[PDB]
Amino acid sequence: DPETCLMVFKNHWSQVVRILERGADDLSAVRNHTYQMLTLLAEDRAVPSAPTGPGPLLEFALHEDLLTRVLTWQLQWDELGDGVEERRAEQLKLFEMLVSEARQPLLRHGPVREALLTLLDACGRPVPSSPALDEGLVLLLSQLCVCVAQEPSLLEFFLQPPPEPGAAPRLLLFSRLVPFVHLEGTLGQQARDALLLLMALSAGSPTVGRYIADHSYFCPVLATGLSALYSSLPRKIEVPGDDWHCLRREDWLGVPALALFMSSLEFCNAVIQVAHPLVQKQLVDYIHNGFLVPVMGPALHKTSVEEMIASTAYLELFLRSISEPALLRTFLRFLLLHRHDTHTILDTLVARIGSNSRLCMVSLSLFRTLLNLSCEDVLLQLVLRYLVPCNHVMLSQKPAVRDVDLYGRAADKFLSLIPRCCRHHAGELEDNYLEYLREARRGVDRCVRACRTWSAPYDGERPPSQPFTGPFMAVLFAKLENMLQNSVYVNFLLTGLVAQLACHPQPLLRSFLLNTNMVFQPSVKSLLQVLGSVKNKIENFAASQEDFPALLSKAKKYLIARGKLDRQGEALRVKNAVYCAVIFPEFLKELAAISQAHAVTSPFLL
């Protein structure tokens, strides 16, 4: 019964106050008396007449501030040094038992909050530290985070005022979780969840958010963590396959150094998703100015080829893993506006498309991810900035930008360029034009729904001396003109980019690529002129090579079977160009079907 607990509680507490008013024996006596009193306090019940009020044991304890005075009586014994990390763990276990086990919400009271705040200062002594003490500290902080997450009004009550005018306040619930974010295992994960809960509570409070964004060093800790973890990554990608173009799930989990970076970036992504806007802007600016500019700025410009491949693959993985638009704005502004050796970073990445190796494949995958983000600014800076002034068209054909290929002139013009060697003489590649029409329908519909938030339609009205279509168009067409010399996996991503770019519903971009009846100024190279040059070169290889119809049959039957299993210079040139004769007519089917589906899209989308 609850009254007998009161008598035996004043029995132990009377022994304890006597011990304070009069060393190892007294310390052991107050430790087991403390254990008994706090286990009895964990099993207090409220009075049934007033269950919303505190119980009688809390009424006796909080009246004279029992917990804080016995805690500071042990902390003045802490200066001896005998059993410091055992006694600290003992009080950690005791106050964790009050936070978890007690059926009343104890934290609404002042004195127990002050006792917990003094205990958090007692555990704030500097390193070295036994791992049991860190485990108990993280567990106590996590349980306190859970309790304050259930009662959100006490985050300002834990924000205790500065001890000096102009000094920083001491939120001991948050600042003690700051060194434990980078730790691995269960302990660092518990610290990350507890800090995420605190940041969710600080989303609804302007005083705590201004404290974290202005009087706490959490954002430099995160920025220096990302900067230090971008030194432990390998500068060499050791993957044996030649079809590898980007870091897969099996790849970045296979490198333990990269997994720590990926977990840290996921934590930063969640913090940017959740926390307060002042805190969000502080972490945005600190992540930018302390990770991207000082580290990733020089790291992309590493001259050696394999370091370039590694940096481009890491950049593509990071752009593929941000979900929040605020951190994505940071990454994309860093890519689009930061200038090194008087050149844009995006210009440097454009210049790496025209390369002869795995660097080209990772660059095409990076630009595939960039165009798959469906952002305005990348597509604008790549092509549309050069297509807004509309100088590539002569003076009398400027209305032809807005025309729509209703009757299939463009599909006929593209399908007329299919080579005579590849045409079926009087094997699933003979009549699959319906399947290209389906994926052109989902291709245009995806690029229409993802452009609904865009500022301008780019229809030619809203908004060198000879016209120039931009360094992205010149490099992409010149690499497309070399389609015989390129690899089969390079051509797969290169035709993947042009098909994905032609699905954009912008009439300035669509008329430049798919409107075949457009004639341009002589300095401008169209997509039709480039594909015509490939058509001439693939037929010249046809007449000069003897074994070609037998080589077409075996190279085709491999390419279906890859979808089902889901002296060197002459041998390489033969192998690439025979592969090019399987891609090019069905690249021609893909560009035809996209130009068909642009005349079909509903008014009830845009």
Binding site: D243, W244, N432, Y436, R438, G563, D566
Partner: protein, 79 residues
Amino acid sequence: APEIQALKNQLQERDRLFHSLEKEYEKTKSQREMEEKYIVSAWYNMGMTLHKKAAEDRLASTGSGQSFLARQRQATSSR
């Protein structure tokens, strides 16, 4: 009375135009109501025939593999 007959004449012409706009508004509302009833009935029969054809459409909608190039690009990541 010569003033009275002219004033009641323009009063009766006012009533004449009132009756003309009355019957015109009645005809307009009746046609719009019947037209909307016809449209909703046609769409409802249309949709019920679509759910009757859904017994075939639940088998016809099955299909995968996409285009050859998209399947090949997605199969490039399989080592």
